[PDB]
């Protein structure tokens, strides 16, 4: 069952690595497992519930380290579907992958904890919690949309910061005497930051008529300027995934893709890496030293294929209509001029 | 080795027709015609953009040697070819039927015959089930 | 008045089932009725107002069960406009519809309550409150837009969760000594969750300089990351209903629709289900064994009609210009090549 | 029954012209022409996509039998035909005047004559008021 | 200076009625005046500051009623620019306009207050505050965008309402014993409504481990579902004013507009309302009973002009490209068929 | 090294003035420096930490004034790359630039503070904090998007203001008797403003059944209307930067730009400002009193070039397809009419 | 009055050429030609949509009478004509120079001569300054 | 001075062909032709929009004098020319290679020869490194 052997290895590498469908259910169950371990460790530090906490913590920690252990080992086993990790040296470079080093690290570490280290336990749980990402795509998407909207976010925070200083300073002036809440400018700044973010603790509220009047004017501006970046980034993600949807449905790069594989096999079949290659070699000795002649021209054909693929790799939604209408109408200009010239050649007779 | 160096030198003098120490675009046109295919002017010019590096309008011997010296491992075409397979990865799992490979490959653009596309299958589908895991093929040859 | 009989049955089935206009006023009045029943039942559990509560609850509950009873029964009566529910077996399968079973269930149930069951009363009121939907379209729209924006929502909650852990942990470290609020890491996590969501109870606020300084930095990040999914889903619904508006005005599928009904009647008139069919039969014996000949070719015509209707059933706003410009310019290519070829045929003479 | 089976067999041999155990697209073209209408190549090909299931390019006897065996109740065309009526449900209530049915049906696409469209009205508008509740018609025949 | 008389009347009617530019500064100053009257009346009800309050209230109320009086009277005087209000009967129908009746009402009313009525004073100030709108465009825009987004808003509030009931009920069950805050289900519902809206008073916070655990899960869902309609309507206004901007720059209805005025004057000049009309009459007796002949055909020309203007009155942004590309390509179809037919007529020779 | 002299002057003027890349790191470090000076000055007013505060404040203030001094002076030195500031008079007009006057002002001012003035210190720090902008682009972008969305923001605040008055008034009526919180209408207005903005201090919460019932209805409307402008402006910035991105990628004004520089050099070379100009002069005496003849026609060519550049300076995303399709199809009309006319000239033979 | 009724009756019999108690579209074409202008088929059809109410294809005497009976006050064209002026209200204040009126009116679409457009100015610009407040003109005539 | 005034007067009478105290668009056409270039009608009309101020259709002596009287410092073309350089400031730093200047300038639109574009470089790139800081050139001449 060597074919079934490789099929099962394929399925393991499919679910464990980049998933498509219901594999998120497996990842969900290990997510809930490690998350409940986190929650129980949190319950451990409470003095009263400590007994039941540890009584379930030892057992469940053994469960989750067994699960992590088999997951890691079968991931190494399933790395065979990838060619870069095949055999001793390939699988060992897969072990040289930094993420897998962190994984085997926390495995042996936790086992060593079992072989005042409780703070280290919760630290390790936060580490293994971050581990769940495996991609860094979250920070990448966030940084992309932040760097895109950088100037507007800076505008919102800057003007809101000036509104915070001004409103808090005026309130402090108007409410120094008859209130023990605002005793310095620092406590006043604490009040400003707590209200403009719409948190509203209630420890420091204006208790005068000058202070309440000033706050009643600057609140409609503060709370509006400190809640801008949330709405901005929100609509940013919305528009970005909307245009990514549109561009996902308009790939239209299949032609250069097939051309890519076409001339790629043309190059490999013309490459001197194998001697049994004659089918494509014959296909060119029929359609008519010569080896390298067809080889060189084929490598040029594969390079123009690769670059054409790179060009058509980026068709957009608005760039489609824009560029194709510029192209369409300029071709149309060649059409109308060819029309007049050729019908004049009919007149020329 | 010097054998392949002089071999590409003979390829240089076969590309060369007038003998100006370089390969013009017209030599490319007439050698493509020498195989039967009649290319366009812009096609050969694009080939020049692939080969030449100093921007002269022709193909000298150093740039021709560099184009012939590098292998697929020296191309950084892993993601490129995986995306090209992805456009024909319709479901997105990583597999395509061998008959669909034949149909598309032999009827789209720079099409080939049946023995050649079957050679692609026998080289891509390693275990030989017709259901090709394109990543095994690109991590075998392209890398 | 059998025609007026069926007309009144039609009007009842129109308002009771899928509504168009002012029928939402009837549904609004029954909505307010059942909602006031809910509110009064809530007032019932209060100890003092219990007397007036029950004094109106008995009466109004009788009113709303009478209304529900007649509504259910006349709905069964008005199901005649639908052909699938006609007569004993049809109307009884309509009674087999799960929603109607739940309805008759709560009817007989409440009557049985009248024939410590008060908790069951409020439970039944929540049930009949959910009943008002009748469609499940709410959860369907929500799930659609959530599954669409799934990765961005997960990004916001994941990074916000890490910000919660980090900020709360640092505060706990900086405010263990001189504060009785933060006594364990669990109370610190409660503080973090209450502030980053901008709730701000006020039971636990930092009372130091290290704690307030750390919170003053991590608040602008917390409150911005925990209020992202609201804005994201908001702009999601906005863009979705905006493109649904655009696509609602650009149906343009009338041609395959009329073709659908056209060849559908062609099939039925050619089908052997009735012998009196000769008009279309004659229409094909004039435009000239033969029965099944025209029948088979007509069934093929109806299948291509159904599939063409299915294709034109999905014209979009951007897909309209994109696909029709690709098509338009490729037709234009056939035009210019036909131009040059035919004018060369003028040159060829 | 075997009577209708042999009846479709005679329809198969009437569709069949050269006798290859199947029905090619050209036989479809010449039988549509045999009734007077001159269809296009792509039209007959689309008909093949409707009938055939193995993807050969023709219409065999099993697929022809299956196409003739199923009724409107075996089509799952309830929502399809209700949407098609909805596009001509302009106000959206569920009703269209009989004269508007005649005008549109007899002047849009594959139009018919007046007796046929009036037969549609007499079969769709059950009680006979000209104001057709399309849902009664589709829940009568289509189901 | 009768021309200057009418010019000054024009300028008054321009600023007082529909404004264009800096007229918002005048309206701003009367806005601040009436608003400060409102604020001072609010300060009047406070017991201590009552003296200074009334001491400025009498004077400033006289100021604002004088301003309102002259504004009303000069508005009547400036209504001459409008033809519908010219002379006794015209200006009196302008006095019959409901808004002006309300205005003269509050004027004479306040004067009568000067000729326990303080509550009536603040009521009248709220009335005259609403008066500032004069258009009702605010409620119109709000209702437009609400009715557009009605189903999504109902979805958000409905699912949020169910989340409120479920979370509050579970908390009530988990926190009946060891807390005096949650004593009935009504107080629990008060807690749920106060937290899910992110108000967070702090009077009732969970003080257990079951309650805090349940709230910690349902808060991320509550606060996200109760803050959806704000973001939805926000992005709704944004998209609506964005497409109104686009459509504002693409009027392109100037041709049917000039045609409208063209054939409108054609009708008036052909109409029998004046005998001195001969210029256009001669313009048609030169370009050649006959009066009504040209009259009738001109009225038809004006009706097709009015309807063509009505059609071109609604060019959109997406409807422009969509309809003009459908039209453009269908004209193109007529072009290619005329091409082949006419070049075949060249072949036919 | 006069070329290296000017190169170093160029690099200084590049980073100090309008930056491109990593120069934001230098500006970030001076930002953190002045910001930490602000924070330390805030810590100074606290009574206890005053000692360490001043102990670091003196030193760090000397550091930041030295940094500001060298920055100002080398900015004057680096103004050589700009031609308008070259030598005594040029660099002195650069010193006449208002921003630089404010800068040298605060420099000499702070030095004078070192040569009860602490309040002046914090005031000067707020001034130098605003100084960091240097452009005013923040207020410009804010005013742009506010003035664009002015009517919707006014609608949200106006209807929310009426909801505030109505809800607060009703609550005040329902909660005058059995609550000491609401003692006047002013305290009730304070409650309304604090809740509808979702701040929620907790000092005044309804403690009845009429009040809580009324608030429970008007809260879903208040909190939704007072949080609209944040979402509106948020989606406004998002859409604006999205279309600015689109328009940033579709400049397409390179042709009139090159034409601008082309005929600009044509004018300068034809201008009488230099006698050594003969190359372009010869270029026109070869392609054939005459000096001013070619000069005048060249100035006309440069003016049409400048105006054509001004026209093509504003290509949009939607205006591109709209205007180019109107143009494309009207050119197409000229094409089809030329087609029919010229093929009729083929028929005319 | 009966005088104008019989006057429109004579206009009916002048529109009428064949005498079928109605006015066909071809009669409209030949009477527009009778004045010199050669209209298109769709133009006359649009005129029929303006006049006729029962949808026959012609213009009877009742619909012709109703078209001739109503005045600008019986049109509800106040907002319509104010919007049409607004499109040529470029600044948006309410005023246009008399020379601009002449230029646009006499060179856009169904243009007229100079005496006619000057009559428009003398009737629209009441006080006679060339700067026309279009609202005074539309509230004078249209209402 | 009166010397340049009478000099532009001679330019006026050289532009002038028929002698109507102004310069018509046809005189512009025939003098552009007098140098060899054959412009279009709309081109000369645009030139009229540049020169004339009262809107007559020709070019009088006052408007011609005003067009010849102002220098680059009297144009407010600083931002205009900086934007035009920015469109060819591809990276956006402020620099372009001299060879790229030659290529674009001598092959885009109203192209010139090599000595002229090299004069542009020697006047724009002050220190003479080929890497032109366009702002130094525009703040030297345009201001």
Tab-separated table of C-alpha atoms in Angstrom, chain A residues 3 6 10-11 13-14 18 20 81-85 251-268 271-274 276-277 279-281 283-290 292-297 299-311 313-314, chain B residues 4 7-8 10-11 14-15 28 31-32 34-36 43 46-47 49-51 59 64 67-68 70-72 75-88 92-93 95 104-113 115-117 119-120 123 126-127 133 135-137 139-141 143:
chain	number	residue	atom	x	y	z
A	3	UNK	CA	0.389	4.454	-2.840
A	6	UNK	CA	1.669	8.293	0.388
A	10	UNK	CA	-0.813	13.522	1.827
A	11	UNK	CA	-4.043	13.806	3.833
A	13	UNK	CA	-0.022	17.118	5.424
A	14	UNK	CA	-3.234	18.595	4.007
A	18	UNK	CA	-2.469	24.729	4.959
A	20	UNK	CA	-9.132	24.164	3.138
A	81	UNK	CA	4.398	15.374	0.501
A	82	UNK	CA	6.704	18.393	0.263
A	83	UNK	CA	9.804	17.533	-1.756
A	84	UNK	CA	12.094	19.992	0.050
A	85	UNK	CA	11.640	17.785	3.139
A	251	UNK	CA	-8.187	36.471	-12.394
A	252	UNK	CA	-8.190	36.093	-16.219
A	253	UNK	CA	-4.485	35.138	-16.055
A	254	UNK	CA	-5.096	31.542	-17.164
A	255	UNK	CA	-3.609	32.176	-20.616
A	256	UNK	CA	-0.127	33.256	-19.383
A	257	UNK	CA	-0.349	30.551	-16.701
A	258	UNK	CA	-0.773	27.764	-19.251
A	259	UNK	CA	1.921	29.452	-21.329
A	260	UNK	CA	4.158	29.395	-18.255
A	261	UNK	CA	3.824	25.637	-17.770
A	262	UNK	CA	3.999	25.129	-21.549
A	263	UNK	CA	7.383	26.748	-22.102
A	264	UNK	CA	8.579	25.535	-18.691
A	265	UNK	CA	8.216	21.962	-19.917
A	266	UNK	CA	9.728	23.111	-23.212
A	267	UNK	CA	12.811	24.224	-21.269
A	268	UNK	CA	13.020	21.117	-19.077
A	271	UNK	CA	17.452	20.932	-20.831
A	272	UNK	CA	20.360	18.479	-20.678
A	273	UNK	CA	19.294	17.149	-17.255
A	274	UNK	CA	17.945	13.907	-18.781
A	276	UNK	CA	15.606	9.991	-22.295
A	277	UNK	CA	13.967	13.253	-23.437
A	279	UNK	CA	9.319	13.451	-27.442
A	280	UNK	CA	9.501	17.257	-27.404
A	281	UNK	CA	12.939	17.064	-29.033
A	283	UNK	CA	8.368	17.567	-31.802
A	284	UNK	CA	10.845	20.254	-32.866
A	285	UNK	CA	12.858	18.115	-35.281
A	286	UNK	CA	9.529	17.402	-37.032
A	287	UNK	CA	8.128	20.961	-37.162
A	288	UNK	CA	11.247	22.125	-39.048
A	289	UNK	CA	24.431	22.508	-32.578
A	290	UNK	CA	20.696	22.243	-33.196
A	292	UNK	CA	21.471	24.337	-28.087
A	293	UNK	CA	19.865	26.323	-30.923
A	294	UNK	CA	16.351	25.175	-30.028
A	295	UNK	CA	17.435	25.291	-26.371
A	296	UNK	CA	18.466	28.956	-26.420
A	297	UNK	CA	15.398	30.100	-28.362
A	299	UNK	CA	14.872	29.663	-22.923
A	300	UNK	CA	14.086	33.061	-24.446
A	301	UNK	CA	10.521	31.855	-25.028
A	302	UNK	CA	10.295	30.750	-21.396
A	303	UNK	CA	11.626	34.090	-20.164
A	304	UNK	CA	9.103	36.091	-22.196
A	305	UNK	CA	6.497	33.628	-20.911
A	306	UNK	CA	7.567	34.251	-17.306
A	307	UNK	CA	7.518	38.027	-17.764
A	308	UNK	CA	4.178	38.006	-19.602
A	309	UNK	CA	2.814	35.910	-16.731
A	310	UNK	CA	4.207	38.485	-14.292
A	311	UNK	CA	2.475	41.289	-16.207
A	313	UNK	CA	-0.521	38.496	-12.785
A	314	UNK	CA	-2.006	41.856	-11.677
B	4	UNK	CA	29.915	24.069	-22.888
B	7	UNK	CA	29.364	25.075	-27.302
B	8	UNK	CA	27.493	28.287	-26.490
B	10	UNK	CA	29.041	27.950	-31.574
B	11	UNK	CA	25.444	28.771	-30.630
B	14	UNK	CA	24.900	30.266	-35.284
B	15	UNK	CA	22.675	33.005	-33.883
B	28	UNK	CA	16.392	35.948	-33.678
B	31	UNK	CA	16.345	31.599	-36.653
B	32	UNK	CA	12.804	31.271	-35.296
B	34	UNK	CA	14.517	28.679	-39.511
B	35	UNK	CA	12.485	26.317	-37.302
B	36	UNK	CA	9.179	27.162	-39.041
B	43	UNK	CA	8.143	39.243	-29.614
B	46	UNK	CA	10.692	41.148	-25.534
B	47	UNK	CA	13.252	38.345	-25.835
B	49	UNK	CA	14.506	42.454	-22.641
B	50	UNK	CA	14.881	38.931	-21.237
B	51	UNK	CA	18.507	38.470	-22.293
B	59	UNK	CA	22.229	40.065	-27.549
B	64	UNK	CA	23.570	34.852	-23.828
B	67	UNK	CA	20.816	33.114	-19.881
B	68	UNK	CA	22.102	29.612	-20.675
B	70	UNK	CA	21.172	29.329	-14.884
B	71	UNK	CA	18.817	26.453	-14.070
B	72	UNK	CA	15.285	26.384	-12.645
B	75	UNK	CA	15.180	31.377	-11.226
B	76	UNK	CA	13.094	32.066	-8.081
B	77	UNK	CA	10.066	30.728	-9.954
B	78	UNK	CA	8.541	28.647	-7.143
B	79	UNK	CA	5.708	31.020	-6.231
B	80	UNK	CA	5.352	32.004	-9.905
B	81	UNK	CA	4.704	28.461	-11.131
B	82	UNK	CA	2.568	27.648	-8.076
B	83	UNK	CA	0.328	30.620	-8.877
B	84	UNK	CA	0.156	29.517	-12.519
B	85	UNK	CA	-0.954	26.080	-11.317
B	86	UNK	CA	-3.402	27.747	-8.908
B	87	UNK	CA	-5.202	29.506	-11.779
B	88	UNK	CA	-5.787	26.002	-13.141
B	92	UNK	CA	-8.156	24.974	-4.988
B	93	UNK	CA	-7.169	21.688	-3.347
B	95	UNK	CA	-5.162	18.428	-7.912
B	104	UNK	CA	-6.031	22.663	-21.432
B	105	UNK	CA	-2.301	22.312	-22.145
B	106	UNK	CA	-2.799	21.071	-25.724
B	107	UNK	CA	-5.486	23.645	-26.612
B	108	UNK	CA	-4.388	26.830	-24.792
B	109	UNK	CA	-1.835	29.210	-26.285
B	110	UNK	CA	1.489	27.538	-27.095
B	111	UNK	CA	-0.026	24.077	-27.252
B	112	UNK	CA	1.845	20.776	-27.576
B	113	UNK	CA	1.052	17.219	-28.686
B	115	UNK	CA	3.241	12.470	-26.023
B	116	UNK	CA	4.660	15.705	-24.603
B	117	UNK	CA	1.737	16.414	-22.263
B	119	UNK	CA	5.463	13.241	-20.397
B	120	UNK	CA	4.393	16.207	-18.260
B	123	UNK	CA	6.977	13.742	-14.548
B	126	UNK	CA	4.941	10.963	-9.471
B	127	UNK	CA	3.050	7.915	-8.196
B	133	UNK	CA	-0.265	17.330	-6.688
B	135	UNK	CA	3.396	21.199	-5.408
B	136	UNK	CA	5.358	17.936	-5.602
B	137	UNK	CA	6.222	18.733	-9.225
B	139	UNK	CA	9.248	21.371	-5.451
B	140	UNK	CA	10.927	18.620	-7.491
B	141	UNK	CA	12.009	20.476	-10.634
B	143	UNK	CA	13.636	24.105	-6.801
